From a paper:
Here we use deep network hallucination to generate a wide range of symmetric protein homo-oligomers given only a specification of the number of protomers and the protomer length. Starting from only a choice of chain length L and oligomer valency N (2 for a dimer, 3 for a trimer, etc.), the method carries out a Monte Carlo search in sequence space starting from a random sequence. The loss function guiding the search is computed by inputting N copies of the sequence into the AlphaFold2 (AF2) network, and combining structure prediction confidence metrics (pLDDT; per-residue structural accuracy, and pTM; an estimate of the TM-score) with a measure of cyclic symmetry (the standard deviation of the distances between the center of mass of adjacent protomers within the predicted structure). To eliminate such over-fitting, we generated new sequences for the HAL backbones using the recently developed ProteinMPNN sequence design neural network (accompanying manuscript: Dauparas et al.).
To evaluate design accuracy we attempted crystallization of 19 designs and succeeded in solving crystal structures for seven (three C2s, two C3s and two C4s). All crystal structures had the correct oligomerization state and closely matched the design models (median Cα RMSD of 0.6 Å across all designs, with resolutions ranging from 1.8 to 3.4 Å). The side chain conformations in the crystal structures also closely match those of the design models. HALC2_062 is a three-layer homo-dimer with a single helix from each protomer packed together between two outer β-sheets (one from each protomer), while HALC2_065 is also a mixed α/β homo-dimer, but has a single, continuous β-sheet shared between both chains, which wraps around two perpendicular paired helices. These two hallucinated structures are distinct from any structure in the PDB, with TM-scores to their best matches of 0.59 and 0.54 respectively.
Author numbering:
A (entry chain A): 3 to 68
B (entry chain B): 3 to 65
Write the structure that this text describes.
């Protein structure tokens, strides 16, 4: 399908960067692509949240088709 | 299909960091899932690598 990731981030004094990711993707009505997209986005979520020197917030947006 | 993202990192400064990623996935015979997995990886990477406080090194493996 197709995917997009735009972000907002904020830097305050002595406070590690705060990051918000907006994840939008289309799975073209394919169940395997939907399962794989949710598993992969979640896998990226677990990797980025674990980073201790940055605060990560998420917004995921599924789209059936273009 | 299932997917997995291994990760590591190291300190460059107290603001700049180096993030390493290893993405593994399967597409379950679905062409749409395969391209979607790759577009998702490219989107995350381009977004993270555009952050001035992050440098990204990554590899992708199919299973």
């Amino acid at each position: 399908g197709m995917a997009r990731v735009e972000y907002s981030y904020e830097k305050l004094n002595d406070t590690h960067y705060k990051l918000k990711l907006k994840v939008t993707y289309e799975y073209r009505k394919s169940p395997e692509a939907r399962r794989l997209a949710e598993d992969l986005v979640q896998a990226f979520v677990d990797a980025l949240s674990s980073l201790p020197f940055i605060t990560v917030e998420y917004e995921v947006e599924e789209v059936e088709v273009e």
